[model samples]
Target chain A: QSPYSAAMAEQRHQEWLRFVDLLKNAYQNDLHLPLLNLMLTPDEREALGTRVRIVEELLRGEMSQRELKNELGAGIATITRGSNSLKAAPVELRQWLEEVLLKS
Target chain B: QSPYSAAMAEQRHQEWLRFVDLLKNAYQNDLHLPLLNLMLTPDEREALGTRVRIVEELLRGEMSQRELKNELGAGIATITRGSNSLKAAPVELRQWLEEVLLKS
Candidate 1:
């Protein structure tokens, strides 16, 4: 059987929903993140979204850390943070996430 | 044990080195792709790299396809290519790749 957990699914749905809201604000008017508490500018959102996508691809097998930084202007440290999450964070989160993100 | 393959390891190393060489040539002069005969320029390589990384991240968990296309400026078709690769391509390739490309 595929390795997965139900509770984690709920958690991911929660996190993803939150992320969507953040995305809305970011692209609402080319908004960026940080400068404003929770609002993310379109560029910033795009950047962040881009960063996330790159990292996701890295996990999927398309890019490497070195390559990702070059491609997206992301920092080594930032990529590492996501890398660490793979091991330290929840399991179903990343596992199911891998399948879910690409599908939807 | 960590899911990995030895044959795949060798394959990934080879592909990654080619990628590195491509990166070097690309950065030497700010360039993109298609205009040149596979003389992978910086932006093109970076874009390719970024796309790879995003797919990888999606495999690891962190982002989704909808979010990926939005951020990377990549077409749904491209994302699908990688997504399809996950299901259709040789496992050893993507598997060992997921570990090596990021680490080295």
Candidate 2:
């Protein structure tokens, strides 16, 4: 159903796993962002960063989704994805999102 | 120049770092994919998976960017983003791309 081959999945899974570790390793050295930046295009970075923004905005309760669309220059569909993620996030994570992220 | 606020970045950086570690921890438990799946929208996932696809195709010498656009249903801009990533990849990482990912 996906665009990728099962063979490729089987083959690339290890590399994918290692890359995950590589990111973690990079985090340890405070360099994960750079490596992630290197790997993702500007657009990809914007997408990910915007996901964070959406959740932040949602928890802040300052703006409606309509307001977010105008603010972020992203579609409502993208905003809903963030809303879904926030709604589905674990309670602990949600708490972190509120108390920790909101504070900054 | 960017869409996010400095306060949000300062606030979210810790969470982002922890999130990276959480992903690594998930990988240790073989559960990273699920959490990542939870975090990303379908389109985001496709965007990421397509990056891998582009590099794999490049290493295999199987398709041009034009062909990739047809096969992946992605635009030339997106394909070029992947191409740039492949071209700029580190030697150590590039070897992993070919020797490890291509085996399957």
TM-score of chain B of each: 0.43, 0.58
Off by over 4 Å in 1: A1-104, B1-38, B65-68, B98-104
In model 2, what lDDT does residue A104 have? 58
In model 2, what lDDT does residue A38 have? 45
- List residue ranges in candidate 2 displaced over 4 A: A1-39, A56-70, A73-104, B1-21, B61-68, B81-87, B91-104
What overall lDDT goes with each candidate model?
0.40, 0.53
Ten consecutive residues with minimal summed lDDT in candidate 1 chain A?
Answer: A32-41
lDDT of 1 by residue, B1-97 (tens): 4433332321122322232233234333433121121222234333443444454466565557456566346555455555565466544444544
* Range of the 10 consecutive residues with the lowest summed lDDT in candidate 2 chain B: B7-16
Instruction: Return the lDDT, model 1, position B14.
Output: 30
lDDT of 1 by residue, A43-74 (tens): 33234344344445565654466554453345
Over the stretch B1-104, how does candidate 2's per-residue lDDT look in tens digits? 55454534322454354446556545555555656544444445555555555554666666564565574365566666565665575665554435335463
Looking at model 2, the pairs that clash are none
Among the numbered candidates, top TM-score falls to: 2
